[PDB]
Design a protein around this ligand. Structure first.
Ligand code: Y43
Ligand code: CA
Length: 426
DNA sequence: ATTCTCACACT
DNA sequence: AGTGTGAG
């Protein structure tokens, strides 16, 4: 009822794509470097930045050319392109390396290519018996921060982390195997081993957050990045939330979180607490207001889905500006290339994960429209065959063509999207 | 001119 | 089925 039933962790690879390239290209280790795609336009678009390049101001979405302006010594690894489009195979396969290690300790929800939530509730219960009732040495937690500690009556980072960890472990009630703080602590000892196993078995370093739910875990993980883990206890939530901007909380990063700020006239997550649940529901709907009411008291029940494998496999490409596709055979040729990349990933999925997709979603964007997708249409995926898929995807879109000429496409297409869905056992 | 995934609520 | 939001 105080949102302390579970022990949940979120593990997040540090500058992941960069690390995959650094393990592979030793010359890039401990240097400012980014991973780019499409070198031709403004040197390439940056999709990942090491921590040494972040110190210079280089960010994602920046053009490599522009990053070179902020950081002249910046080293670049460019993504493999296949069929004219960026190919992430290398990163997906490094990701499977980690997911399989993590999955030896507890059941995982894959959250992205490089983050995963862990429910440690049963594992913690198993260790709490094996541990008799003996103290938890600080040597079990060599990279753990305790959020909100030290407090009360050293000038270097490692000095502060130790003191906070000392105070936490001192006031720790190791005789009471049902106290939620002691469970987080044992969750944190498990994440330490999990993280040591990941770095040993892959060379990949990661940060992690430990708390009682997914949202507090995600936030905690970002508090002491890179290569560290943060425990956030229920007790720390009032002070943590009291100056936490609303947009930092997962799902509040967008238009909803902006309405909360404007409608309620607040800036910080802790300001939500003064409102009744019914007031929050009248403003944002039953589900959103219920969710906010509990979340601002550190309580959320969205759980760790037992799911390590994506649910849709999709292939898309943007054609911005003067590169928009304007002729029918252009559209035909790119749909083919997408279906091919899509085929290559579907058959690898059928062999590894014992399933087949059964519906083909095709989406397109017309020059002049506003939104991610202009139009969605679907059809049957019966055969993993690139030429049928592209033939079928064209068929279910050819009548979007406002043009009167057969050979031309108007309005020209600025995005093409093919997505396999509705998997079944095989 | 970032681009590219993937998930889910609502209808 | 098709649209819209959110996040990595
Ligand atoms: O806006 C984005 N547009 C396209 N792709 C994106 C975007 N944002 C994240 N991604 C994908 C690829 C990225 O390599 C991976 C890791 O994302 P993410 O955890 O936010 O950053 P990161 O691992 O590169 O470094 P860090 O964790 O230290 O912030 O997610
Ligand atoms: Ca990351």
């Amino acid at each position: 009822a105080t949102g302390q039933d579970r022990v949940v962790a979120l593990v997040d690879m540090d500058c992941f794509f960069v690390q995959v390239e650094q393990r592979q290209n030793p010359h890039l280790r401990n240097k400012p470097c980014a991973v780019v795609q499409y070198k031709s336009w403004k040197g390439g678009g940056i999709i990942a930045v090491s921590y040494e390049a972040r110190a210079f101001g280089v960010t994602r979405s920046m053009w490599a050319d522009d990053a070179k302006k902020l950081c002249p010594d910046l080293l670049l690894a460019q993504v493999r392109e296949s069929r004219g489009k960026a190919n992430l195979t290398k990163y997906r396969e490094a990701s499977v390396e980690v997911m399989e290690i993590m999955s030896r300790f507890a059941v995982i929800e894959r959250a992205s290519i490089d983050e995963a939530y862990v429910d440690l509730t049963s594992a913690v219960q198993e260790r709490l018996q094996k541990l008799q009732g003996q103290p938890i040495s600080a040597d079990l937690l060599p990279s753990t921060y305790i959020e909100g500690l030290p407090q009360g009556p050293t000038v270097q980072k490692e000095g502060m982390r130790k003191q906070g960890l000392f105070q936490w472990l001192d006031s720790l009630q190791i005789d009471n195997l049902t106290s939620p703080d002691l469970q987080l602590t044992v969750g944190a000892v498990i994440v330490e081993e999990m993280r040591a196993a990941i770095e040993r078995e892959t060379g990949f370093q990661c940060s992690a957050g430990i708390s009682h739910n997914k949202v507090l875990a995600k936030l905690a993980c970002g508090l002491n990045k890179p290569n560290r883990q943060t425990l956030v206890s229920h007790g720390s939530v009032p002070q943590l939330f009291s100056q936490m901007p609303i947009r930092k909380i997962r799902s509040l990063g967008g238009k909803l979180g902006a309405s909360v700020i404007e409608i309620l006239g607040i800036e910080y997550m802790g300001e939500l607490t003064q409102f009744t649940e019914s007031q929050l529901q009248s403003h944002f709907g039953e589900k959103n207001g219920s969710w906010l009411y509990a979340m601002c008291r550190g309580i959320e029940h969205d759980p760790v889905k037992p799911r390590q494998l994506p649910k849709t496999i999709g292939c898309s490409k943007n054609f911005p500006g003067k590169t928009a596709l304007a002729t029918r055979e252009q559209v035909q040729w790119w749909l083919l290339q997408l279906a091919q990349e899509l085929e290559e990933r579907l058959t690898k999925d059928r062999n590894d994960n014992d399933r087949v997709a059964t519906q083909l979603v095709v989406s397109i964007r017309v020059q002049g429209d506003k939104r991610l997708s202009s139009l969605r249409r679907c059809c049957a995926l019966t055969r993993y065959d690139a030429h049928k898929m592209s033939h079928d995807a064209f068929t279910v879109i050819k009548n979007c063509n406002t043009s009167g000429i057969q050979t031309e496409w108007s309005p020209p297409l600025t995005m093409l999207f093919l997505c396999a869905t509705k998997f079944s056992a095989s």
